[PDB]
Each structure stands twice: as structure tokens, then as C-alpha cells.
Design a protein around this ligand. Structure first.
Ligand SMILES: CC(=O)N1c2ccc(-c3ccc(C(=O)O)cc3)cc2[C@H](Nc2ccc(Cl)cc2)C[C@@H]1C
Length: 127
């Protein structure tokens, strides 16, 4: 089977900006999660060819990963923090939906999600 193309990371038809909250999401939140020992499976799109999981993209039609989120932040793709936070949650939700409750990857996602929530709890005021 084949992989789908990755989620778009820059769209010339879609308005772009930077906010101090989106800066915090890249510089503090994503940066902290990216170098966690459990981050690596989430640093790029799920590769259903490499993993030989032809049902992954039958079940998950809105994939998301931290590599995509990082690129989106780098490209000012998000207009606000809520769009970025939603993508992080889509990434976690996809993981919990596809994988079984006791799987290594689920425990890894749960650890990253706990840390994510700790970090976004101090999202700064908009300047
Ligand atoms: C995110 C998610 O739900 N899944 C996922 C995604 C990517 C990779 C993965 C990523 C990169 C490599 C690699 O660089 O070789 C290998 C596997 C693996 C997985 C998950 N598998 C897995 C991850 C970690 C450990 Cl310790 C054991 C099994 C399955 C799942 C589809």
C-alpha cells in the first residue's frame, strides 16, 4: 500500500501571521516535547509503508504529527494558538484511536500529552 501526502505546511491561499502565543508554542512547548525520549515516533507522519499498516489511513483520515506542527509554526501557518493546540490534540487522539490501550506507543503519547498540558497551562497573554 501507499502513504498519503503529508498535511500541508504552507498554503499561499491561507493567511499567515506570528503571535507571541504561537512563538511560545514553538520555542517552549514544541521545543520541550521534541527532545523528549518518547518524541521520535511523533516527529514525522505515520509511515504505513515502513510499518506495513495498510489499515492506518483507512482508520485515520485526519493524520497529524509534531513534524508537521513544527513546520506549520515555522511557516506562520497558524492564525492563532487554538489551531495549533487542536493539531497537537488531533495527533494524540489519532494515536489513542488507532492503537490498543496497553501499547508502548499509547504510554508514550500519554507521557507527552501530560507534559504538553503542563506547558500550555502557561500560554502567555497576547501582546
Ligand atoms: C504514532 C503512532 O501511532 N504509531 C507509530 C508511528 C511511528 C512509528 C515509527 C516512527 C519512526 C520509526 C523509525 O524512524 O524507524 C519507526 C517507527 C511507530 C509507531 C507505533 N509503533 C511503536 C512506536 C514506538 C515503540 Cl517503542 C514501539 C512501537 C505504531 C503507531 C502506528
Amino acid at each position: 500500500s501507499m502513504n498519503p501526502p503529508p498535511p500541508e505546511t504552507s498554503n499561499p491561499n491561507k493567511p499567515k501571521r506570528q503571535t507571541n502565543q504561537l512563538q511560545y508554542l514553538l520555542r517552549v512547548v514544541l521545543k520541550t516535547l521534541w527532545k523528549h525520549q518518547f518524541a521520535w515516533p511523533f516527529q514525522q507522519p505515520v509511515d504505513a509503508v515502513k510499518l506495513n499498516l495498510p489499515d492506518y489511513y483507512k482508520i485515520i483520515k485526519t493524520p497529524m504529527d509534531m513534524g508537521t506542527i513544527k513546520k506549520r509554526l515555522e511557516n506562520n501557518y497558524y492564525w492563532n494558538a487554538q489551531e495549533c493546540i487542536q493539531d497537537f490534540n488531533t495527533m494524540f487522539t489519532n494515536c489513542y484511536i488507532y492503537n490498543k490501550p496497553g501499547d508502548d506507543i499509547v504510554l508514550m503519547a500519554e507521557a507527552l500529552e501530560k507534559l504538553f498540558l503542563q506547558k500550555i497551562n502557561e500560554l502567555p497573554t497576547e501582546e
